[PDB]
Amino acid sequence: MNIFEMLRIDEGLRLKIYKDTEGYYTIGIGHLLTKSPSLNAAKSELDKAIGRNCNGVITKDEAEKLFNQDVDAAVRGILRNAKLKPVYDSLDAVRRCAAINQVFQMGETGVAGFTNSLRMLQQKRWDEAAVNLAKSRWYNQTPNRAKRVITTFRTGTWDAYK
Ligand SMILES: Cc1c(N)cccc1F
Ligand SMILES: [Cl-]
Numbered sequence: 001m002n003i004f005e006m007l008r009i010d011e012g013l014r015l016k017i018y019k020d021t022e023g024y025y026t027i028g029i030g031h032l033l034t035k036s037p038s039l040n041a042a043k044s045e046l047d048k049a050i051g052r053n054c055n056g057v058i059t060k061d062e063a064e065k066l067f068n069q070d071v072d073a074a075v076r077g078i079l080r081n082a083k084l085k086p087v088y089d090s091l092d093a094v095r096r097c098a099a100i101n102q103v104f105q106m107g108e109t110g111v112a113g114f115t116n117s118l119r120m121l122q123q124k125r126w127d128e129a130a131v132n133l134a135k136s137r138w139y140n141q142t143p144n145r146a147k148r149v150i151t152t153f154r155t156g157t158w159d160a161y162k
């Protein structure tokens with residue numbers, strides 16, 4: 001198990017523009033295209049990112065290219081965030097994947113609001129952090145996944161990903 005397999009399981013793979021859990025246009029492996037409700041806006045974004053007129057459709061290699069780039073940006077985002085960085089370096093390798101997962105799904109932002117949890121995770125209070133993490137719109141909106149990520153932070157193993 002690694003980040004890529006992990007995320008591939010949580011986000012799945014689609015070659016055609018689709019709406020994600022929140023209604024936004026996305027493609028590939030959870031690659032958000034835009035929050036606007038204008039599909040055309042989304043197709044433009046698509047083209048821009050792929051660098052070619054896709055007409056809402058892409059290849060597998062293309063999807064995986066976005067994927068790489070996205071995994072990268074995210075970690076990179078973590079590392080650059082002052083509040084994030086320290087927590088992230090205090091973790092073992094599996095838990096790190098869990099951090100990445102969240103940021104990928106929610107942004108530097110979305111996450112920058114889990115202070116209490118962050119702190120708990122930094123103190124290595126697994127069970128506490130996990131209960132904390134669950135008291136969230138995040139868990140309530142996408143429980144199955146959130147469950148997998150939380151079990152991941154709690155245990156430090158890939159059990160939930162089987
Ligand atoms: C999202 C996250 C968590 N949960 C813990 C440490 C760093 C980080 F970016
Ligand atoms: Cl791109």
Ligand SMILES: [Cl-]
Pocket residue numbers: 141142143144145146
């Ligand atoms: Cl879910």
